[PDB]
Design a protein around this ligand. Structure first.
Ligand SMILES: Nc1ncnc2c1ncn2[C@@H]1O[C@H](COP(=O)(O)OP(=O)(O)OP(=O)(O)O)[C@@H](O)[C@H]1O
Ligand SMILES: Nc1ncnc2c1ncn2[C@@H]1O[C@H](COP(=O)(O)OP(=O)(O)OP(=O)(O)O)[C@@H](O)[C@H]1O
Ligand SMILES: C[C@@H]1CN(C(=O)[C@@](C)(O)C(F)(F)F)[C@@H](C)CN1C(=O)c1ccc(C#N)cc1
Ligand SMILES: C[C@@H]1CN(C(=O)[C@@](C)(O)C(F)(F)F)[C@@H](C)CN1C(=O)c1ccc(C#N)cc1
Ligand SMILES: [Mg+2]
Ligand SMILES: [Mg+2]
Lengths: 358, 358
């Protein structure tokens, strides 16, 4: 009966953003070192997102939606405290942590669909107006970013403490190869459903080293996710906008490496989208191969997670360019985390009613 | 000694956004009709932007900058009132209005450089921090949009009341031709300064009518301005990023006509720009062939003026895409005007100090 106390406590600390080099410059760089770090950090991150949740209108709070998820977090917080007074050295005290993490990770595995159900409930219970959309957008973006950051920590621990890969991090990720894979997987799905699929063209632009293949330090599963989701969209649009013609244009991808950005552009000729609807494509509310996801909004969070971004620009009547912006240097790849402050509080005080433009 | 009274009065009305068809569906569709309309509308628009100005920190207000501009507006407001009690019918009462407009237009001809000087004063007098930049950005965007809308009305009147063109509006503007012209003009300047210039390639994509040339109802001088400024940028970047190589890639432009958007993409290989600096490119504060302008921020306002937009996306180490989004239908081309309300008031109450992200 002390969850509200714990939350209040760790909710005072701010989460510690880690850089990808800190992840790399790390089997047995001591997990005691990780154990003692995660015992404090996970509780701080869990509490911060839980603190935010609790200050949500009760009309959002009371839904089985938010309450169920909010209950998983309460149990995960309690789940990880058991170790606050423990002591490493005991090769058994830290093997119960690893199991404790795998159990917590799986306990939250179905959050996205669960939260999506609360969005739907809200849409039909109170309506879908710009303000409620902005508030939901603001909240889900932070909530999901927070979740991604917690899952990164956990996966880093479980994978490292079960050469080349350091957990989920590839210090020599060959971007083009990940592109190829996300593409092949997308093609397979596209072929089964439409029995026709667009081809792939890839071009690299290594600014400083003209011919060297483009490599980077990154979390490949994350990159794959983004590319795979973008490929599904481009394929759908290309195929559906050409079912009456035969010509089926290719999806072109360009990978450019600059002094600080590593950019990936995916170009299609799927008819494009009206500038006015482009804005709504990243909306959880308005957006509730295709159908499950929260493909774009969540792919974007993955890009932002390490100071990157994911932007879309279309040319109605022609095609769309989807661009993934990542940091080229591991020094600049630092976690982007949302924090609870007096600052984050007033973003929920939106009292909109008659704007500044006519 | 009654300017503060007038301002307070017309500041109660909201400006009336006009659509491009209303401009088109109009020598002598009666200027009496225009005279009586402009007598009320100009004062409403002048007063609204003047009302906004007056609520600016006194530390901005007191600068010779804002005070000089603020004095021109005071005189223009008074300049146009003289006609409030007049009576048309008198072919002389409305010819003094036309002269009164030409005189007011020229009285404000050097606002941009004047305001730019206040920005500079501010930069050195108080510093260039994110908040002051946001406030200045918010204010100058609205101030300049307002000015563009007033100048549109005035030019429509003076030109119509000195076939094919209805004032500054071309009901059959051949986009590609304007592109060609802005390009030729840019090339000439580029050749003189760098004695080398990139070529031009144009491609059209008329969705509904595959081969028909792309035409639209628009204000060509506005389109020219945007294209010309974008061409200068692309030329500079292309030339300067290839002074050590010989190959000099072309600037490619694509014009796409969709059901509601008319999009113009200008692609270059001028090395591109880091995603992080792209954001600052449209900033008046941080941004104070090249040097005078306020090229991007103001070209953008022209795009937004009729519900369009102007976006930039780069690929550091390769090139940049600048896109102009315009409404394809004259029905959707309605003035975008900034208005004074309790809503516009609280955008200046930015008390930022420690954000919501760590
Ligand atoms: N390249 C594209 N061309 C045209 N429309 C696109 C493109 N990418 C996305 N869209 C539009 O934006 C919406 C999709 O965003 P998103 O990827 O988030 O969801 P989805 O594809 O519908 O389902 P899923 O969750 O699987 O992704 C699409 O439903 C489609 O209408
Ligand atoms: N296509 C481009 N490629 C690379 N950098 C660009 C491009 N377009 C703009 N920029 C950058 O953004 C800045 C320019 O914005 P803007 O056009 O507003 O001003 P300017 O060219 O410097 O002077 P001017 O007022 O004449 O336009 C440039 O100074 C340049 O650094
Ligand atoms: C041990 C911590 C956390 N860590 C890890 O890789 C993991 C496997 O433990 C995990 F991903 F799960 F987090 C590195 C970023 C190094 N590291 C630090 O550099 C660190 C940062 C801040 C502090 C403090 N105070 C202590 C250590
Ligand atoms: C006469 C007004 C203004 N007008 C003009 O073209 C000009 C030349 O007068 C100018 F550009 F300077 F504005 C058209 C948009 C038609 N028009 C209207 O359609 C209108 C709109 C609202 C009202 C009102 N009340 C009256 C008329
Ligand atoms: Mg999708
Ligand atoms: Mg310029």
């Amino acid at each position: 009966g002390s969850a509200p106390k714990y939350i209040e406590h760790f909710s005072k600390f701010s989460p510690s953003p880690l850089s990808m080099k800190q992840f790399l410059d790390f089997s047995n760089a001591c997990e005691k070192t990780s154990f003692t770090f995660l015992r404090q950090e996970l509780p701080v991150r869990l509490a911060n997102i839980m603190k935010e949740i609790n200050l949500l209108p009760d009309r959002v709070l009371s839904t089985p939606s938010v309450q169920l998820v909010q209950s998983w977090y309460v149990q995960s917080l309690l789940d990880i405290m058991e170790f606050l007074d423990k002591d490493p050295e005991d090769h058994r005290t830290l093997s119960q942590f690893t199991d404790a993490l795998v159990t917590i990770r799986n306990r939250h595995n179905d959050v996205v669909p669960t939260m999506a159900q609360g969005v739907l409930e809200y849409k039909d219970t109170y309506g879908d107006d710009p303000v409620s959309n902005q508030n939901i957008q603001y909240f889900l973006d932070r909530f999901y970013l927070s979740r991604i950051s917690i899952r990164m920590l956990i996966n880093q621990h479980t994978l490292i403490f079960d050469p080349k890969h350091i957990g989920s991090i590839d210090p020599n990720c060959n971007v083009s190869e990940v592109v190829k894979d996300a593409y092949d997987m997308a093609k397979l799905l596209c072929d089964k459903y439409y029995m026709a699929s667009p081809d792939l063209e890839i071009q690299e632009i290594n600014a400083a080293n003209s011919k060297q293949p483009i490599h980077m330090v990154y979390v490949p599963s994350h990159l794959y996710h983004m590319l795979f989701e973008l490929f599904k969209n481009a394929m759908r649009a290309t195929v559906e906008s050409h079912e009456s013609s035969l010509i089926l244009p290719p999806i072109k991808v360009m990978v450019a490496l600059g002094e600080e950005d590593l950019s990936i552009k995916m170009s299609d000729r799927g008819g494009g989208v009206p500038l006015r609807k482009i804005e709504r494509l990243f909306s959880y509310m308005y957006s509730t191969l295709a159908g499950f996801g929260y493909g774009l909004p969540i792919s974007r969070l993955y890009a932002k997670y390490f100071q990157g971004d994911l932007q879309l620009f279309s040319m109605e009547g022609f095609g769309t360019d989807a661009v993934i912006y990542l940091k080229a240097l591991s020094t600049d790849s630092v976690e982007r985390l949302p924090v609870y402050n007096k600052s984050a509080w007033r973003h929920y005080q939106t009292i909109q009613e008659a704007g500044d433009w006519c």
